[PDB]
Structure 1
Amino acid sequence: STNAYAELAGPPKIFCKSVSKDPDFRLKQIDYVIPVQQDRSICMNNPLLDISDGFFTYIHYEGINSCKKSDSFKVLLSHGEIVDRGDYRPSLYLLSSHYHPYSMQVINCVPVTCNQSSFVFCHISNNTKTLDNSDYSSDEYYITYFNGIDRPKTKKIPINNMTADNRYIHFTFSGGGGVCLGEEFIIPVTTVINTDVFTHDYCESFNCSVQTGKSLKEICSESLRSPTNSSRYNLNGIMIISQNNMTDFKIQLNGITYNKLSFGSPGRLSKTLGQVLYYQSSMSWDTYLKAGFVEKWKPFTPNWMNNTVISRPNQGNCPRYHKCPEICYGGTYNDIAPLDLGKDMYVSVILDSDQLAENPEITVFNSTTILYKERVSKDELNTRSTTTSCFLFLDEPWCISVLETNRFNGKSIRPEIYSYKIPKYC
């Protein structure tokens, strides 16, 4: 929470808002934060990073000969700060680090950094298939928090007293980060319901090649079904937790607006430019960027951006750039951060590729066109998830991104942190 760090907010600063060719991001890797493992069987996957008010929470999953979070035998929780080391750029300083008490039984986690302390919201279960075979009464939900001087403490969330805005059999914390607004945490969630209660207008308004044997209404209704258990529907939502000195809890679970639904996936809430931005990874037929600022909390309603440029790679009938309704599952999580509201521009580390997860490119865009880009590595680089957060450092916009990278295929896999500066000139 240094004098150098300030949330990116207030009046716009001076930097490049336009097309630019070969710009200077001042791109540098950060190597001392993420732990190192000599055992090449261990796979450090699904990095998560949330940054608020000068402090960061970092989370990553470690598992043996598997890159899946439920297979992780250790899940890592780090707390740190953003500081001026005097090299004219922001540096990450790592205060404390711990392992989740329940790591072996951890299904999924989401970080949120609040009041200069780390919070980690976890869905932990003895069933790895729990979001198919089971319900949320049989699993457990925890909050692990620490500030780096302290001892980490984890408390069970009273899910039994939760209020819901619909009848859900299951839910998981899924995404790259959450926010704290006042006394309440809000976490990206995905819900499971066994009957089809959803209305797809947006999907149904699409006139294009549609396979014979099924109606638009039909494939749209069916596109929200869990590809593992077809009798279940996965719908994104938020969980709001009121908390008093971490004692009296008020939990309520609401579903996302029905306006432009997409199959339930990981996504995130973030405070930026004095607003709250929701991102949702696009795992279904609509392959373009799905995100928006939150105009209305009940029902949870982000004003969805209409974006014709930013997309993601996937194998199957929904590769990059493909917007026609279809029943398909896949794609990668690349979340975004806003720079200027008036010029409507955002930064994201996106994969430049159609079917394959690789070639991370730092991209700066408006909703219509891509203003400018730079490949992170000059050599071909294998990469899956990317998270990005931005801020003001010495009164200039700077970003920190974590890339989920597999460098030497099947060798020791660790995510890589990078930092860069938004160009002052075009």
Structure 2
Amino acid sequence: CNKTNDHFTMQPGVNFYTVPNLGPSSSSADECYTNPSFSIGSSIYMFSQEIRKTDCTTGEILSIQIVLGRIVDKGQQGPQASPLLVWSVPNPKIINSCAVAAGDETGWVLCSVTLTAASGEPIPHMFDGFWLYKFEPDTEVVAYRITGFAYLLDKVYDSVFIGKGGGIQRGNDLYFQMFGLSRNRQSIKALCEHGSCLGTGGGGYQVLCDRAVMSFGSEESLISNAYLKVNDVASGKPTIISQTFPPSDSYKGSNGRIYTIGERYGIYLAPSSWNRYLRFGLTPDISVRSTTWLKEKDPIMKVLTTCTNTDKDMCPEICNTRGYQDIFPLSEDSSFYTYIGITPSNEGTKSFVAVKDDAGHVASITILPNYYSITSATISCFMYKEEIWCIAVTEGRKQKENPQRIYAHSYRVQKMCFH
């Protein structure tokens, strides 16, 4: 189909098939499965999950399970998951966060660690560098510790977390996103994009904007986002450099994702503050200056938020948002993308899946109607049986009584040529 003259429609199919056994999962009520990462490669997929005790946010990290596997036909209607290796991150109590990336037959887990006490116990919310784990079918896991000998951040970070969305490989480099506390001696003017907001008073919402990026109310400590580059992975001596987004080009730092989009890249930034619209940029090279942000507002995070602002004007305020609902671009310009929306109910949440075009037409389909709640979504698509398919990995509870768990469902995107 001549991409020049012919026109095209993209739509979510009718079915939302289970992809069981993408990762293992236990039945224990005492445990919560949280902060997944999912990256599909040319032939492999990588998946990470954190198993925490009691609390899904501050609960002790009992374990971080990594899965290397393959997406395959098992005869079933949709694509299925064949796990190749199941592995635990060692010394999980010292981990801040970990994310994954898939290449050809090679996966990566990048983990940011915190300072350990003399006692050996964690010094919470700090930064002792990184662990990079290299995963290859039927080969042993390889471990590269990245301390200050082999990493150079562009600010002084007291905490470093890896964006749960995961990363991408490009030649000999990997690309991930990070967030944490940087140290600032610069005056700030934070990004303050809202709609019709009629509250003047002192600097007003720009003062509120400036304050919502600070940690603990001091411009000396910002919660910041950064591109994280891993160089020279073929050497066995990888290094790590960072490019931090300044407050004028970002909201409060958050979990994010890096995307290969054609020969360029993209970046998702889950809301963490007052501005709960889609924060997705494109960049021909992974750099803060060449990053352009999409004018798309949907998905709008309307869940896991202490925010009280309207989705229509999103007026700034000091509030805390905790979700994750990325997109997967379906065209070179992200002109079409797919996403899951999640809306609060009087009891739980209700979700839809959607493909959206440049023009604001949305083809949505309600999903998981017999689930009690779904609270996150990371989606990765691929070619399978010569059709566009996606897997959406989603936290939630099939039953309210149940502990939080992570599920994978599959769906097709129909590409309709109109010749």
Question: Is 1:195 matched with 2:184?
Answer: yes
Question: Is 1:120 matched with 2:70?
Answer: no
Which residue of structure 1 lines up, in the alignment, with residue 9 of structure 2? Answer: 17
Shift of 1:193: 2.0
C-alpha contact (below 8 Å) 1:33/1:92 kept by paired residues: yes
Which residue of structure 1 lines up, in the alignment, with residue 320 of structure 2? Answer: 329
Please give the secondary structure, in 2, of the residue aligned with 1:68.
coil
Which residue of structure 2 lines up, in the alignment, with residue 245 of structure 1? Answer: 234
Which residue of structure 1 lines up, in the alignment, with residue 20 of structure 2? Answer: 31
TM-score scaled by length of structure 2:
0.86
Tell me which moved more, 184-193 or 405-414.
405-414
Q: Over aligned residue pairs, what C-alpha RMSD do you find?
A: 3.1
Question: Is 1:157 matched with 2:149?
Answer: no
Please give the secondary structure, in 2, of the residue aligned with 1:218.
helix
Which residue of structure 2 lines up, in the alignment, with residue 256 of structure 1? Answer: 245
Note the 1:286-305 alignment, pairs <5 A.
Answer: 286-299=275-288, 301-305=290-294
C-alpha contact (below 8 Å) 1:238/1:300 kept by paired residues: no
Q: Distance in 1 between matches of 2:31 and 2:334?
A: 44
Question: Is 1:97 matched with 2:86?
Answer: yes
Please give the secondary structure, in 1, of the residue aligned with 2:210.
helix
C-alpha contact (below 8 Å) 1:193/1:232 kept by paired residues: yes
* Counterpart code for 1:394: K
Alpha-carbon distance change, 327 to 129 in structure 1, aligned in 2, over 3 angstroms: farther
Shift of 1:410: 4.8
C-alpha contact (below 8 Å) 1:307/1:368 kept by paired residues: no
Alpha-carbon distance change, 408 to 227 in structure 1, aligned in 2, over 3 angstroms: farther
Q: Distance in 1 between matches of 2:225 and 2:263?
A: 24
Q: Distance in 2 between matches of 1:250 and 1:352?
A: 41
Q: Of residues 381, 393, 403 in structure 1, which corresponds to 2:384? A: 393
Q: Of residues 32, 35, 40 in structure 2, which corresponds to 1:43? A: 32
Shift of 1:191: 3.5
C-alpha contact (below 8 Å) 1:55/1:116 kept by paired residues: yes
Which residue of structure 1 lines up, in the alignment, with residue 367 of structure 2? Answer: 376
Question: Is 1:365 matched with 2:345?
Answer: no
Q: Distance in 2 between matches of 1:271 and 1:300?
A: 18
Question: Is 1:352 matched with 2:314?
Answer: no
C-alpha contact (below 8 Å) 1:312/1:331 kept by paired residues: no
Shift of 1:144: 1.5
Number of equivalences: 408
Shift of 1:173: 1.4
Shift of 1:192: 1.6
Q: Of residues 164, 172, 176 in structure 2, which corresponds to 1:175? A: 164
| Structure 1 runs not aligned, ≥5 long | 1-9
Shift of 1:67: 1.1
Question: Is 1:142 matched with 2:131?
Answer: yes
C-alpha contact (below 8 Å) 1:25/1:422 kept by paired residues: no
Identity, % of aligned pairs? 18
Q: Distance in 1 between matches of 2:37 and 2:102?
A: 12
Please give the secondary structure, in 1, of the residue aligned with 2:22.
coil
Q: Distance in 1 between matches of 2:153 and 2:255?
A: 20
* Counterpart code for 1:31: P
Tell me which moved more, 69-78 or 122-131.
122-131
Shift of 1:265: 0.1
Shift of 1:302: 2.5
Q: Of residues 275, 280, 286 in structure 1, which corresponds to 2:264? A: 275
TM-score scaled by length of structure 1:
0.85
1:109-132 CA-to-partner distances (Å, cap 9, x unmatched) read 11111231221111123476743x
* Counterpart code for 2:163: S
Q: Which has the higher contact order (CA 8 A, sep 6+)?
A: 1
* Counterpart code for 2:337: Y
1:190-248 CA-to-partner distances (Å, cap 9, x unmatched) read 13223363643641786623364653442221110136988621110011111243522
* Counterpart code for 1:255: T
Alpha-carbon distance change, 223 to 45 in structure 1, aligned in 2, over 3 angstroms: same
Q: Distance in 2 between matches of 1:120 and 1:64?
A: 22
